[PDB]
Subunit: 393 residues, 2 copies
């Protein structure tokens, strides 16, 4: 005869069996859109810096070299006219910025989440976990609470709020979702990244070109994924499996990317050769992830890389010796959306599956079986997620 319920019995019945699987991806952007070709004129106009001719020249080259075609931005000329301190380089403006992003970040998240949930096709009540990630603003209760309420999720959905994370955190949310889905039978994780540049937007200064780099690259967007183990093939449609997820700090990278939340909003600093650091270390990250899987040809896997800037992509591609095709999905998202911080790699994942289907590839990973997703950010931190594709009909 059995004894009372034991912790061992609970654990056995509680855990899921298979790998965490991406079951849906939805994305959303602000409606307002600005062509990169027009951005130097627009930016220097609305920040009233047109007299800074040599600086505008520098900014022109930064935009021209960004390999970005357009970005979406919640911030409009009208909003900026109501917030003149945001147009200065460093004027007190955190409250004004918070007032915007504490509302707009979960609102944009809702739009991406609704699309993911519609694709998924299951009731909202079946969502067991919500992971929300942003680098734009902070509040209590957080954007996770706001989104859960907006979506009408169950009150006992398990939430994790990831604040002030930075550009590597698309990798981080997948790494978190992986453990949540795999360790909990029936778990269906809604994971959302939502980024709004109103917290970082600021005017130009001659003494801080690295800050102007941010003004050339950063754009707005949100992406949502549904992640679960043990998909029900009768009603769910797997897109990618997660296999492993790791995070590391690169040697000799202290202070390479710093960000501080101050009374003037979120400031961005660059101190080292970020593309050089990443490309110098990327092969060891690849080996660490793939040697245990018996994989060594980096041209034989599909690629999702955080497009921090075009230089990162160029130098990784050259260092590793990737065929030009490998970075196409990544570069597409950089071109059409710019650098949306944590949400980028999720947009690229979406692009990857969609083009794979449209182009009649054999798998959701451009015909390949294994793939890698990289997040890059403050640390210098590298998130590495090994993916496996799924066959397409």
């Amino acid at each position: 005869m059995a004894a009372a319920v034991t912790v061992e019995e609970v654990r056995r019945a509680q855990r899921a069996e298979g790998p965490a699987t991406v079951l849906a991806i939805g994305t959303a952007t602000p409606a307002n859109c600005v062509y990169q070709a027009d951005y130097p004129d627009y930016y220097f106009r609305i920040t009233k810096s047109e007299h800074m001719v040599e600086l505008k020249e520098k900014f022109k080259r930064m935009c021209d070299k960004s390999q970005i075609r357009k970005r979406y931005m919640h911030l409009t000329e009208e909003i900026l006219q109501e917030n003149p301190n945001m147009c200065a380089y460093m004027a007190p403006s955190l409250d004004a910025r918070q007032d915007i992003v504490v509302v707009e970040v979960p609102k944009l998240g809702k739009a991406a989440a609704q699309k993911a949930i519609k694709e998924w096709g299951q009731p909202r009540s079946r969502i067991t976990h919500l992971v929300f990630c942003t680098t734009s603003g902070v509040d209590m209760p957080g954007a996770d609470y706001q989104l859960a309420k907006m979506l009408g999720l169950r009150p006992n959905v398990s939430r994790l709020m990831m604040y002030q994370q930075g550009c590597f955190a698309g990798g981080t949310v997948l790494r978190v979702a992986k453990d949540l889905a795999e360790n909990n039978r029936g778990a269906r994780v809604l994971a959302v990244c939502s980024e709004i540049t109103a917290v970082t937007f600021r005017g130009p200064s001659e003494s801080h070109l690295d800050s102007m780099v941010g003004q050339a690259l950063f754009g707005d967007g949100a992406a949502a994924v549904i992640v679960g183990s043990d998909p029900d093939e009768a009603v769910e449609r797997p897109l990618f499996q997660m296999v492993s997820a790791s995070q590391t700090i690169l040697p000799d990278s202290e202070g390479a990317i710093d960000g501080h939340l101050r009374e003037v909003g979120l400031t961005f600093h660059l101190l080292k050769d970020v593309p050089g650091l990443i490309s110098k270390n990327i092969e060891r990250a690849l080996g660490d992830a793939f040697t245990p899987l018996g994989i060594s040809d980096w041209n034989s896997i599909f690629w999702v890389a955080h497009p921090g800037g075009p230089a990162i992509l160029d130098q990784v591609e050259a260092k590793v010796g990737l065929d030009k095709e490998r970075m196409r999905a990544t570069r597409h998202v950089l071109s059409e959306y710019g650098n949306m911080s944590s949400a980028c790699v999720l947009f690229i994942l979406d692009e990857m599956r969609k083009r794979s289907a449209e182009d009649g590839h054999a798998t959701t990973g451009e015909g390949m079986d294994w793939g890698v997703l990289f997040g890059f950010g403050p640390g210098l931190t590298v998130e590495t997620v090994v993916l496996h594709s799924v066959p397409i009909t």
Copy 2:
């Protein structure tokens, strides 16, 4: 190699287990009996006589004996804007806490690691939680660097969560440890009230409540599945971890990070809301385990204020002994936000051993840990004790 093969080898086998607990506080200590005089003196507020009387009653009722505070009179003199009720001071506050939060976390982590007795290189994950300040890279990066952890430690940085997050960090550590063979998770909560300290104002008393209750502290645990029971010494097992939002609690506890620092706003009856809903939380957690007698389990509850504890006790009908460890920590440390429940777990296993009880949970096999915070959010962690050996 197939993905199914990888997964079977990758995952751990048993329940996430707390293997060590370490705690630390700033050196500077203030007796609650002295605090109204002190607070009204340094904030130059002596003329607000009726208000000081109200604050005196708040501290009298707090059931706090003393608190530790990084903030000193000397630091406050250098930051006069922090002593106003509302003056621009976020930068000053950030300058302090971005440094002090991971520093205090380091002290607690070193003690946990010493107790654990394994090399630092065996730590695979670091979860860091604070409600005091934000930065990039975060306090998690700073702590990893300060401790000399492996560069590829998997970090999770939990910012701005508030008082329920001691529950949250355990909920996170649980899934990390259980889903990853060999994983050993360092989880740290570190809270420093420099971010919320401000002068008194007769127009907002809920802000003065915070000045009466909040104190500084950090706690660290090592969590792992499949312990080596010869060299690793289990203290508590986690069994389930849940989170919920109480009905009709919208706006009960709000906190905003502004140019004047972190402000807090109470809008509903928090002890009433919690006590009204706590039996349902107990039920949701324990019914699947065949457990219904709330006096037959050990208790760890976030001591948000004495009224929460009193009203939960009265509603549930708890023997007064059940809240002893919780009230001890509130008495000796005040409300240290997320770190509190970890201090209380430490208190419970220590007193259990001193009293000669049969388990780390005051002689009982099962227990519950509650975090309470903005939402109104309740974290519920079901624990199992370990026989004292």
